[PDB]
Design an enzyme around this catalytic site. Structure first.
Site, short mmCIF file in Angstrom:
data_model
loop_
_atom_site.label_atom_id
_atom_site.label_comp_id
_atom_site.label_asym_id
_atom_site.label_seq_id
_atom_site.Cartn_x
_atom_site.Cartn_y
_atom_site.Cartn_z
N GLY A 1 0.81 -1.21 0.00
CA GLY A 1 0.00 0.00 0.00
C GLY A 1 0.84 1.26 0.00
N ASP B 1 4.44 12.49 11.45
CA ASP B 1 4.14 13.02 12.78
C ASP B 1 3.73 14.49 12.71
OD1 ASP B 1 4.91 10.50 13.63
OD2 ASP B 1 6.96 11.13 14.08
N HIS C 1 10.84 8.92 15.74
CA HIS C 1 9.70 8.46 14.96
C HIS C 1 9.05 7.26 15.63
CE1 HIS C 1 7.96 7.80 10.63
NE2 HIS C 1 7.04 8.06 11.53
N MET D 1 1.42 7.36 5.00
CA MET D 1 2.87 7.27 4.87
C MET D 1 3.32 7.42 3.43
SD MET D 1 3.73 4.19 7.55
CE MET D 1 5.51 4.33 7.36
#
Lengths: 296, 323, 323, 323, 323, 258
Positions: free
Chosen positions: C12, C159, C185, C235
């Protein structure tokens, strides 16, 4: 006045009571309530077509005490055979709670749910039908595996093969279901219903020419199968024989309500859906004189 | 201002389509999502993309399919644009008819639910096949009685895109923005009018090859994808771009001219052919004609309409067996 | 003339990121997709886009994970920017015992193979354990030795982008383009900065819950998805945006300042942190200090420095165990 | 990067053109303003604006027009594109035909001084009359010793804009992008080609009316402005768009197709006409034929090119008369 | 839709601003122009540019200045935004008092004629003595009977643009988008808050000289032009951006924050000041506090407010004049 | 009143239906006598009482226009004097009085046209009026100052001088030297208006409100409270008060404005 006021007052009271108990919005126009106590009307009738007012007689006898399995199975079977599979679901769901007996329940119920779109409940109903049988009592995948685990066991078992065929119809695998019904019917070439369920798996298989050959003489068995003539109508529509399809659909609407329906109207039990078969049919002929304008 | 709704989200043409729409949807608008599985998924997943001024809604459903889902007829209220983009995967066998015999039914359901709460929302059809699904949608709308032929858009721009990318790769330094494509959206129902484009144009033999390829492209993908999958991505951009065309217009910020699959209001036979159209604030307001064509193009068109005449008859007759 | 190569466009975070990179890259650029299984399918899928000026190509690798496969070597020739996306497919692992180990070998392969042919590459790390893989990536570069502190980078926009969305929901129309998040992270290491924001910042009581949300924001994605994947599209979008920023910086058309996981030489005692950096046409030119902070961030940084030191210690302990 | 000289600014067509180029040029571009009076004022006024990354350099001249001004030669190093607009109507009340001689004489020395140091640079003359000054520029370049027919572009996009605006004004809910124009750039020498665009066309009477309106509009616009002067806003827009296209093509990020008044290289009897042409990384790369022309409007081109013969012949006769 | 109306079309500022504004307007705009002299000429010039979708309307009164010109109450129907850009810009050696005297009457007449046709229209003040003419506009609105204290914005972005341009040059690679400014506009009423922006600030000694250069720019521009005019483009460029921001906020597809001369409800003692505000679908909604201030900045601020007290005294108080 | 309607129809000059005087076969002597005392507001209603009956100039329209210009309602004055100008394009005083009336509000070209008309009827303060059209107030004061010494018998001749140092900053001279012009023929509402404006310019001066209230009081003297009669053209200070009370100290007398 007092000598007969109760005969109507208590009748309406119990009718409304039964109405508000569970389900089944009874037809207001019975003309049977004063002579429906000899339940054998449905046995004296319906043996020679005319399976329309027999449903009314069964409704009139079922408006009484509801703890009779016959009064709640005959209505379901007749209504399913009459192509009015809307109140049949709720009536047979009420028949559910009257113990898992009467294996006629859970047999047509698998057909009842797979009628419109109810895939999920059909498998549960079929599983309940299978488990309510002590002779061989010893999730689509699991449901079909359970049936496949018997196959040869109880070889004849016409009801088991009928259930297998109905389940196969839900998987969009009409090719193998076609030969299932083909070799299933030869065991009992008496009941036309097994022939009817055959034609469907040929009608959905884009082979209407053979499918009609299944229906025709089956109609000779009982000229009251509204489903069979609905199949003829849809097959004639598929063959682009639009005038004959229009004649067949008009005859279907005439025969389905071929009784006291004009004078015994109820809540129309969504019969509009069947009327929808007429709709868009003239879209092929563009009968501008009538079209949608006569939807009332 | 607008409330776009996506129905076939998260399957294989979902998340990508919603992501593409999110990055280009105008400020001050809402985007919805729906699917039987994964609805509480990507919907919450895309809540981490800021895009200030955009709110995301969602609605779930029971895993066993149920006609007229009670949860579905909650989010459908208040929407303005519908994108029926729900389909089924492509198994190795997938013979004709039978596959369609499935893909029709779900589509009909996905039309019956979101029709009694907003009979004023522009529709869109993406499910493969599209040459036959659009008549099914038209008849399903006609059953209730609220049908507007001006909003029955059918995605076929994947075709347009395809043509440009090829004719711009042969004639290299030259580049054209759009190439007309009238017909339908499958096999021999696609005529790429490569003779109304500005330029010098290549020779005949070549034109022929390029033409046919436009017609048999899906195959390549399906094949290349080792007997699995199909063409999600491409089929998404097309959808996204088109959607915008519609949205902007409705608000009054552009009057675009497209090439959709809209019923023909008395035009050249074949009442569901593809012709150039111009959009507007009320859907489609004018239908341009095909225009002049040469002898070679009319050879394909005279037989392509015959194929369409068969699919269009098989489409608006769907009644499987009742029973 | 820039050449962007995507290594691991399978999941993905793959196809979606590659598609976002396409249709938005500058004219004349080249996209080189790579994968282990399914590369030809995705390559053929994206070859039908009206995106003239790009010559997308692919070179699939062998299914057996043989180190230094020649298939990747040919594709990795003449590439200016590398982005690393491959790793664990969907994270079926029990805990960090094997995820820190199974991703280690694929990181070894995907860094050494690319570096052996393209020294000046400016690799970008997108794998889930950024705080551990970035020192590991530095060690892999230092093994043969091409290492330069202004080359290795690690994406961290997830973030910051997540934190930005939270505030705009609470406050009415005071849109803040970005918030300077600091730390690492992972989990508690994240710390949002709020003192360097114009406007009436809310009280500490309500703001504490907002600070808690950012650190714990990764948990609810799994909770709502029933433990079937997590953080797929977000992401990919953040990675695509960071890659575009890096490409624009290399093109010399912009010199912006961002926040990326970098080798902080000097200033803070930690070697690798998340400090603001400005991008020039060489890599990283000038670093910036954290700036003034109020009372509550002091203890948060005191905890974050220890957590970062322990994570880097774990990474260095795993280092030189196979090479 | 680039260096777009706007020599001749601070007067008429200038100033506005510089303002448009300031906010349109790519990052890193450098401007250059030159004029005989008031240039420092414009340079100071165009230096306090935002969008850092663009630097402004300027130089002024000597009131007495010393041919080959030494100051101008200082504002010539590093320039790649020149926009020569030395337009001034010093005798508006006394309207008689010495403006041709004055403009030609000014352009002669200007182009000689500019090309004496920067041979490999494109030229984008916008100085009426553009029909005869371009042959004068070609003769001057031939006399210098270096000449290249690839980069001698004469701006003629104003006719295209004027035709497109009118054609998009009767056809109400339908808009088009560009319209071809072939010929010269003066009164009788311009003829629109309403036979190379998609969509239905109107009747012949309104087509002829639109053709005449596009044919003659300078007298209308002059009479509207109380006979004070010609139009200076549309010319600036057309020049800015054309030079932006040129600078984009030179940088290597686009290969657009435009209509230019350039040497025909023997492809047409008159060796100067406004034809389609595609720009490239090093100037003109491929000329294109006019294409199909309707026989109804074919007769106009005969007298157009006939007038072009006389205009060009006068251009060379005047040029040889001086030197 | 929207209808921007620039008052004072012809000149040196009004035509450049109109040209810049009619290039990025939203689709469907109905821009209208007015001037005593010129105006038809500029309208005819601007009616030839491409990008159809915008309708240009124009009006022009008689040459002798007549109060309440009929053309104003002919074109002022159906208007959303009024950009008042008028008053003599060719200031001779006379002092500032004569400029105020000649501008006050023009502003009074223009606002009085404009308000009585469209009370629900935002006003954008551009005249140089904004500090003193803003209360004049307030009086003009109040004496009629309609006055909204959220639709009386004043242009002050030029000082901010100058400040950010001056800082972005010092710190080189680092670049910023905006720099806060407080106070007023005229002479010493400007205090740029340099300590509220990210990045290490330069040395304190320099900050004084950058502040002084920001304060004194008009005199430098005038001296650069040798007293032959003023900055006729910088004020015509920032005004266009401010008008675009206002119209975008009014359409609802934006919610920005800007520094504008507005009325202070409570907050500061001075009735007018330059403080951050946020627009909306109706107007000014949330006035924002200035925030932290440094000691030198606060003493400059108190000096500025002391000066603007006398400025508002010379403004709101002036009443009228009679013989 | 039929004659009143007819003269309203033919002449744009408004006529107040309220006519306390009416009749008065010989209005001129008392009209010019009582204004020498004070309050020409009655005197203007006397001259209109004869202008209704006689459209002839006979100095009636000229004196009416001059008196209307003396009061601070110099908008009716232009239309009133236009009829006298067109009927008798011979007298120079009608054109001279029209030049200032036009240049009061905003009329620039009209004043230039009027001064040419005034000058052409001459076979053989104008400079100051011309300078008032421009913004040369600093050098404009010279001619007005010189004119005072020549004929120090009429307040108006230097009243325009006072406004010279009222509309061009420096609220002086007239602030103290020529604020007593009411001593002869007290009706100069212009003087009180200029004094209030100068007081406002200098500083707060709460007594300016009292001064302007008194100005309105004698301006609104006897026979003035009559009905509407198209007398909205007064307006003027009706707005200006809403200014001061809203800003200066009170900010609570806004309701006392309609």
């Amino acid at each position: 006045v007092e000598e007969w006021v109760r005969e109507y007052a208590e009748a309406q009271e119990q009718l409304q009571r039964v109405q508000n108990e569970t389900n089944y919005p009874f037809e207001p126009n019975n003309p049977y309530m004063y002579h429906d106590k000899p339940m054998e009307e449905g046995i004296a009738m319906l043996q020679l077509a005319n399976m329309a007012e027999a449903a009314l007689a069964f409704e009139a006898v079922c408006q009484k005490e509801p703890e009779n399995v016959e009064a709640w199975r005959r209505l379901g079977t007749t209504q399913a055979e009459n192509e009015k599979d809307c109140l049949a679901i709720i009536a047979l769901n009420h028949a559910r709670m009257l113990d898992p007996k009467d294996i006629a329940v859970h047999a047509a119920l698998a057909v009842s749910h797979t009628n419109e779109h109810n895939v999920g409940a059909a498998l549960q109903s079929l599983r309940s039908w299978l488990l309510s049988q002590p002779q061989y009592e010893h999730e689509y995948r699991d449901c079909c595996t359970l049936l496949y685990a018997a196959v040869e066991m109880n070889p004849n078992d016409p009801q088991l093969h009928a259930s297998l065929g109905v389940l196969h119809n839900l998987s969009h695998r009409f090719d193998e279901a076609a030969k299932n019904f083909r070799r299933a019917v030869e065991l009992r070439p008496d009941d036309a219903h097994m022939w009817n369920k055959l034609g469907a798996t040929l009608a959905n298989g884009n082979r209407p020419q053979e499918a009609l050959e299944a229906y025709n003489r089956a109609l000779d068995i009982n000229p009251g199968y509204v489903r069979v003539m609905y199949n003829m109508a849809v097959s004639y529509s598929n063959m682009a024989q639009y005038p004959l399809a229009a004649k067949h659909i008009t005859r279907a609407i005439a025969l389905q309500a071929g009784g006291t329906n004009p004078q015994g109207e109820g809540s129309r039990i969504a019969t509009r859906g069947l009327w929808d078969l007429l709709r868009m049919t003239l879209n092929l002929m563009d009968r501008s004189d009538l079209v949608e304008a006569s939807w009332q | 201002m607008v409330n776009v709704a996506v129905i076939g989200a998260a399957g294989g043409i979902g998340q990508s389509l919603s992501l593409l729409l999110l990055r280009e949807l105008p400020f001050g608008s809402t985007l919805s999502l729906y699917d039987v599985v994964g609805a509480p998924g990507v919907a919450a997943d895309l809540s981490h993309i800021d895009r200030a001024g955009i709110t995301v809604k969602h609605a779930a459903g029971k895993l066993p399919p149920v006609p007229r889902d009670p949860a579905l007829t909650e989010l459908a209220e208040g929407v303005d644009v519908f994108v029926i983009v729900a389909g089924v995967p492509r198994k190795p066998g997938m013979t004709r008819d039978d596959l369609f015999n499935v893909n029709a039914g779900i589509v009909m359901d996905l039309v019956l639910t979101c029709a009694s709460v907003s009979p004023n929302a522009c529709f869109c059809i993406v499910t493969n096949p599209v040459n036959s699904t659009t008549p099914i949608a038209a008849q399903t709308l006609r059953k209730i009685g609220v049908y507007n032929k001006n909003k029955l858009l059918g995605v076929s721009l994947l075709d347009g895109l395809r043509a440009t990318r090829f004719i711009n790769n042969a004639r290299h330094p030259l580049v054209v923005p759009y190439v007309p494509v009238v017909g339908g959206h499958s096999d021999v129902t696609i005529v790429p009018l490569y003779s109304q484009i500005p330029g010098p144009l290549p020779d005949e033999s070549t034109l022929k090859e390029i033409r046919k390829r436009v017609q048999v492209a899906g195959t390549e993908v399906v094949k290349a994808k080792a007997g699995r999958g199909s063409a999600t991505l491409s089929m998404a951009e097309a959808g996204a771009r088109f959607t915008m065309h519609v949205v902007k217009a409705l608000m009054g910020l552009d009057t675009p001219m497209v090439y959709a699959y809209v019923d023909t209001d008395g035009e050249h036979e074949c009442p569901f052919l593809a012709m150039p159209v111009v959009l507007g604030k009320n859907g489609i307001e004018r239908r341009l004609p095909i225009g002049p064509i040469t002898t070679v193009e009319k050879e394909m068109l005279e037989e392509a309409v015959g194929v369409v005449k068969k699919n269009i008859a098989k489409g608006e007759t769907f009644a499987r067996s009742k029973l």
